[PDB]
Design a protein around this ligand. Structure first.
Ligand code: B3M
Ligand code: B3M
Ligand code: ZN
Length: 544
């Protein structure tokens, strides 16, 4: 009955999707699929983040328009996410008319309400190319150790940090010219005016405790005005009434959540839902799934922007940790920096969805993809616990009972134990305690396989006159499988489809209360095969 808008962070246009992105998009998708199963109106929204200096320069280097380049990456990203069955209702772009109009609107409101300040700053400028240089586009000699060819504000030899204005013999990364300091008028968003509002949100108990604790450190350091303009040349949105000035990408980027929703509404011919979700008096819920590195933008700048422009604020932020592989940050040299597209050449989507879900919780801790453990866990849990209930039982039903399940449950008490678990499992999905849900589900799968072992169908099947017993046992196993696959439906969409085809039924949350009795099932070829370390070794080699 709820109306829910869920987003994931908008991926950078000039990088391929990797396993770190996938942690976020999978976490959100599992949650979204569960909410849809419980009957809510869910809108799952994303987009590519397509603006800024790096994108402008990369397109120039490639000799194509930035529009051509971002279009190609958008397609690549969407192909990858589709391969993982991420169920967006809309995937748009920050480079869109909807985002342009909303960015101009919000800026205009902020300005009228007194939250935009003008101040002149000094910044390094490449006089040959004719552009201001972000820090990482300045290189030079470390002032401390005198090592050459250091970029931006830090030295990768001695570890020193400094302003790029301190580099010896600085050079533009773009042209090789010596940059010089130049003045420019910038526009600033008055974040400090929202301090009290933001502190009250932090204290409210909605946010993850770890995020609220970090917010306190940020308040203690002191909020500052935020520079939200960039000079031409730029790839982005021009500021009304300010020729040669553009909105900084991070101003327009979260507005792209709104732009993507507006685009969806407009394509659907829906003239009411945008305001229903975004007006101050909204009764819809708004959730952003994000990583740790972008919390500042989403927890401070974004709710302040919304408040200052007469829009509702997020209901919650759901922050996750970083992905590690084999315990460490992804490493190109070790072949553990793994692209989403590469993953799918070696493994299916469900395997990674399962593994991440088994490790995820409501806290912000890092999630480790241990590749040896991945093989062991997928084989143990998917192949040998859950799918086993179907695979060990279906053959007898198809071959000796014409595909027809028994007319009554062999063990109604055991079935009730399984259905009674729905409340705790659903609460675990809802609360993002995914690992707890998976532990509960796998404890049930253990009980189901213990039931089948206790009945010993491999013995019953050879014994004269025991056909009815065999049908009973195997049907019971299949009914337990039906329940477990319902609980796992948000996690394993493709396996679920194959299970639904076998069972001749769509799996619904409430449907588990009616077991399959006197019911025809279909034959199947392997629902889920084992994986092995040779495949992991190939993945790693392909990623080097
Ligand atoms: C509105 S969420 C935007 C997220 C950024 N594109 C993440 C990044 O580029 O690192
Ligand atoms: C509480 S989450 C925000 C704090 C993170 N340590 C910021 C980062 O990882 O860049
Ligand atoms: Zn140095």
């Amino acid at each position: 009955a709820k109306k829910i808008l869920v987003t994931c962070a908008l991926p950078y246009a000039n990088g391929s999707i990797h396993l770190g992105h996938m942690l976020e998009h999978i976490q959100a998708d599992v949650w979204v699929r569960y909410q849809r199963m419980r009957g809510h109106e869910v809108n799952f929204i994303c987009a590519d983040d397509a603006h800024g200096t790096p994108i402008m320069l990369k397109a120039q280097q490639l000799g194509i328009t930035p529009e051509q380049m971002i279009g190609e990456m958008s397609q690549e990203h969407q192909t990858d996410f589709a391969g993982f069955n991420i169920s967006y209702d809309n995937y748009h772009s920050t480079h869109s008319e909807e985002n342009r109009q909303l960015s101009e609107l919000i800026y205009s409101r902020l300005k009228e309400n007194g939250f935009i300040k003008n101040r002149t700053i000094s910044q390094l400028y490449d006089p040959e190319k004719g552009m201001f240089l972000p820090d990482r586009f300045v290189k030079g000699t470390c002032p401390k150790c005198k090592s050459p060819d250091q970029y931006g504000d830090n030295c990768e030899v001695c570890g020193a940090t400094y302003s790029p204005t301190e580099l010896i013999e600085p050079k533009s990364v773009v042209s090789g010219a010596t940059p010089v300091m130049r003045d420019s008028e910038h526009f600033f968003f008055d974040l400090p005016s929202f301090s009290e509002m933001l502190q009250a949100w932090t204290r409210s108990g909605a946010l993850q405790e770890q995020v609220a604790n970090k917010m306190q450190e940020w308040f203690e350091s002191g909020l500052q005005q935020w520079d939200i303009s960039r000079d031409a040349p730029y790839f982005g949105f021009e500021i009304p009434n300010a020729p040669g000035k553009y909105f900084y990408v991070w101003l327009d980027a979260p507005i792209g959540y709104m732009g993507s929703f507006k685009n969806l509404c407009d394509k659907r011919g829906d003239s009411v839902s945008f305001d229903e979700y975004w007006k101050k008096d909204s009764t819809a819920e708004l959730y952003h799934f994000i990583g740790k590195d972008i919390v500042y933008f989403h927890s401070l700048f974004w709710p302040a922007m919304l408040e200052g422009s007469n829009f509702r604020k997020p209901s919650n932020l759901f922050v996750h940790g970083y992905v590690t592989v084999n315990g460490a940050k992804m490493s190109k040299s070790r072949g553990t920096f793994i692209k989403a597209s590469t993953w799918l050449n070696h493994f299916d989507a469900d395997s990674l969805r399962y593994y991440y879900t088994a490790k995820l919780s409501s806290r912000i801790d890092d999630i480790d993809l241990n590749l040896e453990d991945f093989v062991q866990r997928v084989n143990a849990d998917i192949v040998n616990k859950v799918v086993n209930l179907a695979s060990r039982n279906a053959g007898f039903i198809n071959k000796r009972f014409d595909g027809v399940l028994a007319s009554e449950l062999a063990d109604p008490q055991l079935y009730k134990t399984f259905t009674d678990a729905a409340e705790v499992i659903g609460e675990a999905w809802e609360s993002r305690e995914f690992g707890k849900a998976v532990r509960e589900i796998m404890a049930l799968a253990d009980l189901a396989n213990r039931y089948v072992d206790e009945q010993a169908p491999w013995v019953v099947a050879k014994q004269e006159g025991r056909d009815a017993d065999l049908q009973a046992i195997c049907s019971m196993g299949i009914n337990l499988f039906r329940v477990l696959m319902t609980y796992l439906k948000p996690v394993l969409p493709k396996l679920t489809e194959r299970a639904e085809a076998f069972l001749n039924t769509e799996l619904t949350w409430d449907g588990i209360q009616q077991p399959l009795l006197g019911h025809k099932v279909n034959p199947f070829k392997a629902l889920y095969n084992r994986i092995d370390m040779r495949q992991v070794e190939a993945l790693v080699e392909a990623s080097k």
